[PDB]
Curated annotation (Swiss-Prot):
It comes from Homo sapiens (Human). Deubiquitinase, which cleaves 'Lys-11'-linked polyubiquitin chains. Might be required for PA28-20S proteasome assembly. It is found in: Cytoplasm; Nucleus. This is OTU domain-containing protein 7A. The gene is OTUD7A. It is linked to Neurodevelopmental disorder with hypotonia and seizures: An autosomal recessive, severe disorder characterized by global developmental delay, language impairment, impaired intellectual development, hypotonia, and early-onset seizures. Belongs to the peptidase C64 family.
Length: 73
């Protein structure tokens, strides 16, 4: 029984702006300037910035009236 609960990983100590910057760019594919700008607007909360960027990248049936392919769920 390992990592079954949580296992607090991916954290430097509390927050390092340069580490949060580099990982964002690595995890989203965004540029470092855009990364820094989003991060200042998220209080440099890494996961919040990751989730924000990918959300505006998802677009959940916002453009088309009804997006229904042969999907699972």
């Amino acid at each position: 029984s390992a990592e079954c609960w949580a296992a607090l990983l991916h954290d430097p100590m509390t927050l390092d702006m340069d580490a949060v910057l580099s990982d964002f760019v690595r995890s989203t594919g965004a540029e470092p300037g855009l990364a820094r700008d989003l991060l200042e607007g998220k209080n440099w909360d890494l996961t919040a910035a990751l989730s924000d960027y990918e959300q505006l990248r998802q677009v959940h049936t916002a453009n088309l009236p009804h997006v229904f392919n042969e999907g699972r769920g």
